[PDB]
Amino acid sequence: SMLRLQKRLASSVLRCGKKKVWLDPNETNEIANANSRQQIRKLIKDGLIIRKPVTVHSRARCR
């Protein structure tokens, strides 16, 4: 319903910004239940939350 808290918690445990946190758009109810860490960590460990990769800034053109 409203995952503002989970995004903040997931970014903190993932040690990444809120850009890089991916919450599963289909399993919104499951993430919405995770009101704490060790619940976010559980969701991270089973793949419902993924740290998105850094968008590529290649240096090949410069090289």
């Binding site: 239940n33 704490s36 619940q39």
Partner: protein, 354 residues
């Protein structure tokens, strides 16, 4: 469409087994309840034989789950019900001539068979018990006998309410305030179809109207008091808790998750008692109950010098006639009253049999 009904021959037999297991446990206790005993000891031994007998039955099938549906609840001369102390609490030594109310539930594959009786302990041979206590429990039994005759699809729940009120007035007594008997089915104890005893304004405006339906389980109770019918709390720890599988909160305490894990494993949905653990049980309960993950069963005390009575049985509704599988050993020859029945309609329902 997957709910189990009493239509099956195998289901009826074990339901007759549940009535036998309820009657045999009550019979074992009534003989073993005497003056100068430990109320805690009767509960542990009350549980003790109910563990073994439910383990030795049906040796050829050891797959389904069976056990307790409602803990051994006891209350003597001052409490309504929902009283079952822990080991740390002070014991209540049963004295001479007390009347004590005992409640117990047994579940087999989620089907609930629940019985509860009130009796006076250590009644000698040839004696005649008299007083205002001689009135309350006799009135309650006529509520039971009336209820047995009037339990049939077609007789409404509100007729049960007035009938119990009218006999209560006939016996100069009043039921305790706002209790609920329930219509039972598989894997449940808090059925939506409930019948209410001794209601008031808030109760009658929020209670439901419904007609008794066939092939159903009815856990009928009668709670009658000799005084005013009002109860409150005197700061005694609430022990009996039941989980609700509807709502959910994510526990943050290791003991609460462990307490909630152990509750789900052993007493998934039926009301349990904190005697089944104790150091970690008490501190895990506060967090779960705070977030209403468990619905409590508090203790209710009456006034000093007030007496309360209770009778509960489970009955199965067949089209041809109800049969009460669980009963308590009450006799009218050793127990009389000074006021009698005055209403003609009450007369008809007691002389008629089934």
């Amino acid at each position: 469409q997957q709910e189990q009904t009493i239509a099956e021959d195998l289901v009826v037999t074990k339901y007759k087994m549940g009535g036998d297991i309820a009657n045999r446990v009550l019979r074992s206790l009534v003989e073993a309840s005497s003056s100068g005993v430990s109320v805690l000891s009767l509960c542990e031994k009350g549980d003790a034989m109910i563990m073994e007998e439910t383990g030795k039955i049906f040796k050829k099938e050891k797959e389904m789950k069976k056990g307790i549906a409602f803990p051994t609840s006891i209350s003597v001369n001052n409490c309504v019900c929902h009283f079952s102390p822990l080991k740390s609490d002070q014991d209540y030594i049963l004295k001479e001539g007390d009347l004590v109310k005992i409640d117990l539930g047994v579940h087999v594959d989620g089907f609930i068979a629940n019985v509860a009786h009130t009796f006076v302990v250590d009644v000698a041979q040839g004696t005649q018990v008299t007083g205002r206590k001689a009135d309350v429990i006799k009135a309650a039994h006529l509520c039971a006998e009336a209820a047995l005759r009037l339990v049939k699809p077609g007789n409404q729940n509100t007729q049960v309410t007035e009938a119990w009120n009218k006999v209560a007035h006939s016996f100069n007594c009043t039921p305790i305030e706002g209790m609920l008997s329930h219509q039972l089915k598989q894997h449940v104890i808090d059925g939506e179809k409930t019948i209410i005893q001794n209601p008031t304004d808030q109760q009658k405006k929020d209670h439901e109207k419904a007609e008794f339906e066939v092939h159903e389980v009815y856990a009928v109770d009668v709670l009658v008091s000799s005084g005013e019918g009002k109860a409150k709390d005197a700061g005694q720890r609430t022990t009996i808790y039941k989980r609700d599988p509807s709502k959910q909160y994510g526990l943050k305490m290791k003991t609460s998750r462990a307490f909630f894990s152990e509750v789900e494993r052993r007493f998934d949905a039926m009301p349990f008692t904190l005697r089944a653990f104790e150091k970690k049980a008490r501190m895990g309960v506060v967090e779960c109950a705070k977030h209403e993950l468990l619905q409590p069963f508090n203790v209710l005390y009456e006034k000093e010098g007030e007496f309360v009575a209770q009778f509960k049985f489970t009955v199965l509704l067949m089209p041809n006639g109800p049969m009460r599988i669980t009963s308590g050993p009450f006799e009218p020859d050793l127990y009389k009253s000074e006021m009698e029945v005055q209403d003609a309609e009450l007369k008809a329902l007691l002389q008629s049999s089934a």
